[PDB]
Design a binder for these strands. Structure first.
Ligand code: MG
Ligand code: MG
Ligand code: MG
Ligand code: MG
Ligand code: MG
Ligand code: MG
Ligand code: MG
Ligand code: MG
Ligand code: MG
Ligand code: MG
Ligand code: MG
Ligand code: MG
Ligand code: MG
Ligand code: MG
Lengths: 78, 43, 386, 224, 136
RNA sequence: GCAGUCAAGCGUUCAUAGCGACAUUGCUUUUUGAUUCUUCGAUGUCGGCUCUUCCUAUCAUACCGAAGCAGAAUUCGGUAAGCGUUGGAUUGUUCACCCACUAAUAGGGAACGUGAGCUGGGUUUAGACCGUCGUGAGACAGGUUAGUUUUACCCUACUGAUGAAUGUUACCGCAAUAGUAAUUGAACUUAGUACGAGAGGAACAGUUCAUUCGGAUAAUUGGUUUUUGCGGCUGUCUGAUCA
């Protein structure tokens, strides 16, 4: 089993859900719903749509998980 | 080189209509024609 | 004169008349072939339709292109608690048919069924089976007569059972009583099996195992009055037609001077009895279990219940039969499941299925999340919540 | 022995198989009449692997490879890729390629020492063709055709090519490839020679419709 | 899915009636292909026979080189705009309708095919998958 | 129009496998004549679209018999109307003729089925043009252009839907009678085997898909939007911000 991600926004797509679009230049796009798919036909930029993952990653929206510290070090010596 | 192709296309069996009393041959339009066999029905 | 261009007729003529069926609960017109070599069992079962969801599984059909591949599939979920057994019914055979000789009821009965014997419960003095339960007061002269009666005579033997509607998310409190045939050995052992099971429970896993082909018997979704176009699937007349185009133009020829039964007319659509055969069971899930929708490959502790409930139903806190395809009748509705009538060798009805995954997202509009735990993890902390 | 065979009823074997030195691949949905050609003469020399690539039965046109490496597209699943991890010997190097130009078997056209590829292939992908296989890559086109792989069978000893090709283009390839090339046809005059047949040192399998004048030119130049 | 076709095709949705003009994917002179008939169609009063991805259709060349024009000839459909479900799960659709010109045995007349090709067209016809660049 | 009977000539030898002339005996009312019984206080006068049903004189589909049937491909005949018989270019057309798919593109009937079911291209009022005819008014079943298609609410039939009266009321069944449905094709395998001097070239059993038809259903995909649910935009009105 496999779970692919949405091309426009960034959400995960469970099996048998949303469309797929093979463009004329041999490129593959997956959509979760017709909202993300209609914004693709209307020629919209996903960096400027507030609800997308491409917006919230670029604008530092909800970055408390990423920006917080974490342990990562070692020293064997031999 | 030769003996390769089929060059068929046209069907091997076909139909003609005939007036039995008068002795005339039908055409696809309204023509009835006058040909007592030989060279005309070949054409 | 002749028809010009031949074309096959619109509609099937052995589904007539299309008239509103006689009750929501459909009759089982035919039980399977009795074999007295094998032991006593139940041939059918009662449940309530909950809804549909999606499955993934690995196909195992040698010769196909899709061999050792994954496939999505649609499934229905029929909610199915235990049934309670309260009586027996013995049928003697005559030159005119099967005739019911005697019925015998249990000492005690639940309110759930008493209900079914009234139209105005709340005003009732509730006197049903008050005089019958007094038969059981003495040692058993009048009761054991009527089972010796069924042993002596009687060719077939049905058992009278009812649902526990209360263990279920519906409004009504009045249960569905029914007959169910026994296909065991010796009319004596069938009635002695009934004798024992008066006011006893029967679950679904005893009747139905997994991979079993079953038939579904129900009343179909209703639509009231309907025109000839959608009812019978007939052609629309063109745009220029004065006074109506969702019609049949010629209702009939001059002779016979009478409109025929065979032609299509406007009228009732839906709410018909329908038996639908050869549906494969994919899961007999348990009620008391918090890994109901869990699988071998999935490993998440979850029920089959989707996010925010099944729409217009509820939760499923009970046993159920997850059966492939679709099934006649709408959600909430009483359904009869029945064992197959013949031994289906086929090739297909034999293929043992093992599920990969069951979709448990919201059915109330384009759900993105399987669990509420997976919803909080993806988004993280918000203004409310943690 | 130039063994004649079909797949179900197809003469195009190079669609359904990929024959090299160290290994051999075949499509799944076939009869025992298909495998008698492959299994009999080899016997117990090299591993014959039953498989499918990207859920298709056209592995020859999807794959491309020699003795050291087998290239595949991204569609190959973990079930399909892990089956090749176990089946093949320790010396070979399998790898997924990321490129949106084609299926690899029409593009790539190669053996041990030298390789021929599609002229429009990018620089990011072409290093992985050199690194994994261990072959110096050069971009060429057979007599105008960009799809080299379907109109040119190749090997260490020699190579069969497209029928309508000039004298200069064949002799120019002999400088780079270091072998004697012969332009011919297969399967009763099919110009599609690359997909019609397969070839290696030990064997050269082809379709059942190949005639005796045509089967003489195959087995001579490849040197069996 | 029959005329020298290597395999049995699973049903996929129809989006190319009689009277459609799909594009010419191959490189043998023709520009676009006016479908006139679909090989292996049924019959029903008033229903137009319609092709799909992987079907062999009879066609004329309406726009192209003058040798291919004014003759009915066969042809195979390699792309589709009407979306179809696959058994694996997804609904997918290419950007346009397009096909290649081919003889009644199922062999290619062209040498190369521009753009992508369906996987369901490729399995079915070996000589289409021979000349393909991309597959899906 | 359709069917026997006799069999001329054919079919390299050979009347009767099969083509089959002329005679002689019939059936049909899907042709056209012949007649004038019914209707002139009016039975809507072409074709097409739509839709049911019936006939067999069976094009296909099932099982058979014959062959001047090696195989393949055909031809002739028997039971059988269970089940199907198409998409288009030109013409108002019926009819005709072509292109294409197909398992097959069989023939007919039901007031020459069907206009309070449609359409109105055609015919057949009045306007108008040409040609020939006529001194002229005018004729032409010759060509051409434009020309009102009314009414159901009654009884019956068909479709669905209620319902008094068999001590009351409720629950669970029986089944007389009536209806009834599934249909055809590809591929792989059998096999380049059977058969044949070669060229060519099968079938039963199995596996897999599909065509036409039917009954459901709405996980998903798509369609629909007065959820006037959320968001935007124009002009104007509430002094401006909001609303
Ligand atoms: Mg009108
Ligand atoms: Mg929903
Ligand atoms: Mg029509
Ligand atoms: Mg008179
Ligand atoms: Mg009168
Ligand atoms: Mg009248
Ligand atoms: Mg008969
Ligand atoms: Mg028309
Ligand atoms: Mg009439
Ligand atoms: Mg009438
Ligand atoms: Mg009228
Ligand atoms: Mg006039
Ligand atoms: Mg004059
Ligand atoms: Mg008019």
């Amino acid at each position: 089993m496999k779970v692919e991600i949405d091309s426009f926004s960034g959400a995960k797509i469970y099996p048998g859900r949303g469309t797929l679009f093979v463009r004329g230049d041999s490129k593959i796009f997956r959509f979760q719903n017709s909202k993300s798919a209609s914004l693709f036909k209307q020629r919209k930029n996903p960096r400027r749509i507030a609800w997308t993952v491409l917006f919230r990653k670029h604008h530092k929206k909800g970055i408390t998980e990423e920006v917080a510290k974490k342990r990562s070090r070692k020293t064997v010596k031999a | 080189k030769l003996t390769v192709d089929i060059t068929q296309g046209i069907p091997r069996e076909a139909n003609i209509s005939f007036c039995r009393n008068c002795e005339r041959f039908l055409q696809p339009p309204g023509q009835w024609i006058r040909a007592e066999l030989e060279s005309r029905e070949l054409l | 004169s002749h028809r010009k261009y031949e074309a096959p007729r619109h509609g099937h003529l052995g589904f007539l008349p299309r008239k509103r069926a006689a009750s929501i609960r459909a009759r089982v017109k035919a039980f399977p072939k009795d074999d007295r070599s094998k032991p006593v069992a139940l041939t059918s079962f009662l449940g309530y339709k909950a809804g549909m969801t999606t499955i993934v599984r690995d196909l195992d059909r040698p010769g196909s292109k899709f061999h050792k591949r994954e496939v999505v599939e649609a499934v229905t979920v029929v909610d199915t608690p235990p049934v309670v057994v309260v009586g027996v019914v013995g049928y003697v055979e005559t030159p005119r048919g099967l005739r019911s000789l005697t019925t015998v009821w249990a000492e005690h009965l639940s309110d759930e069924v008493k209900r079914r014997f009234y139209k105005n419960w709340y005003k009732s003095k509730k006197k049903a089976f008050t005089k019958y339960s007094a038969k059981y007061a003495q040692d058993g002269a009048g009761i054991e007569r009527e089972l010796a009666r069924i042993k002596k005579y009687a060719s077939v033997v049905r058992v009278l059972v009812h649902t526990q509607i209360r263990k279920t998310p519906l409004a009504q409190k009045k249960a569905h009583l029914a007959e169910i045939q026994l296909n065991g050995g010796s009319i004596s052992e069938k009635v002695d099996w009934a004798r024992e099971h008066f006011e006893k429970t029967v679950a679904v896993d005893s009747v139905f195992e997994q991979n079993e082909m079953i038939d579904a018997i129900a009343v179909t979704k209703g639509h009231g009055f309907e025109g000839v176009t959608h009812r019978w699937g007939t052609k629309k007349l063109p745009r220029k037609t004065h006074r109506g185009l969702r019609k049949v133009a010629c209702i009939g020829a001059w002779h016979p001077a009478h409109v025929m039964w065979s032609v299509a007319r406007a009228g009732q659509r839906g709410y018909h009895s329908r038996t639908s055969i050869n549906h494969k069971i994919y899961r007999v899930g348990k009620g008391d279990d918090e890994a109901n929708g869990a699988t071998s490959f999935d490993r998440t502790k979850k029920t089959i219940t989707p996010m925010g409930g099944f729409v217009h139903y509820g939760e499923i806190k009970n046993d159920f039969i997850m059966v492939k395809g679709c099934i006649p009748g709408n959600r909430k509705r009483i359904v009869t499941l029945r064992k197959s009538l013949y031994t289906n060798t086929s090739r297909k009805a034999l293929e043992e299925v093992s599920l990969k995954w069951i979709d448990t997202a919201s059915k109330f509009g384009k759900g993105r999340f399987q669990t509420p735990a997976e919803k909080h993890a993806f988004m993280g902390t918000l203004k409310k919540d943690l | 022995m130039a063994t004649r065979t079909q797949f179900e009823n197809s003469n195009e074997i190079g669609v359904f198989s990929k024959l090299t030195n160290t290994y051999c691949l075949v499509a799944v949905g076939g009869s025992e009449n298909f495998y008698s050609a492959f299994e009999a003469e080899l016997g117990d020399a090299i591993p014959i692997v039953h498989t499918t690539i990207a859920g298709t039965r056209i592995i020859g046109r999807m794959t491309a490879g020699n003795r050291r490496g087998l290239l595949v597209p991204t569609q190959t699943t973990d079930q399909e890729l892990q089956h090749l991890r176990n089946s093949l010997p320790d010396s070979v190097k399998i790898q997924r390629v990321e490129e949106r130009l084609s299926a690899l078997g029409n593009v790539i056209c190669c053996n041990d020492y030298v390789a021929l590829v599609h002229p429009d292939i990018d620089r990011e992908t072409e290093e992985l063709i050199s690194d994994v296989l261990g072959v110096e890559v050069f971009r060429q086109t057979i007599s105008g055709n960009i799809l080299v792989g379907s109109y040119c069978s190749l090997s260490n000893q020699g190579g069969l090519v497209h029928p309508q090709t000039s004298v200069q283009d064949q002799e120019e390839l002999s400088s780079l490839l270091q072998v004697p090339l012969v332009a011919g046809t297969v399967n009763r005059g099919s110009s599609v020679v690359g997909a019609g047949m397969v070839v290696n040192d030990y064997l050269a399998v082809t379709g059942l419709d190949t005639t005796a004048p045509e089967l003489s030119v195959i087995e001579s130049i490849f040197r069996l | 899915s029959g005329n020298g076709a290597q395999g049995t095709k699973f049903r996929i949705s129809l989006g190319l009636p009689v009277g459609a003009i799909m594009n010419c994917a191959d490189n043998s002179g023709a520009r676009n292909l006016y479908i006139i008939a679909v090989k292996g169609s049924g019959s029903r009063l008033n229903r137009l026979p319609a092709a799909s991805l992987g079907d062999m259709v009879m066609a004329t060349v309406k726009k192209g080189k003058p040798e291919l024009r004014k003759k009915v000839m066969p042809a195979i459909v390699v792309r589709q705009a009407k979306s179809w479900r696959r058994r694996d799960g997804v609904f997918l659709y290419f950007e346009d309708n397009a096909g290649v010109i081919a003889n009644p045995k199922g062999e290619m007349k062209g040498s190369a095919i521009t753009g992508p090709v369906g996987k369901e067209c490729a399995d079915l016809w070996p000589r289409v998958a021979s000349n393909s660049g991309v597959v899906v």
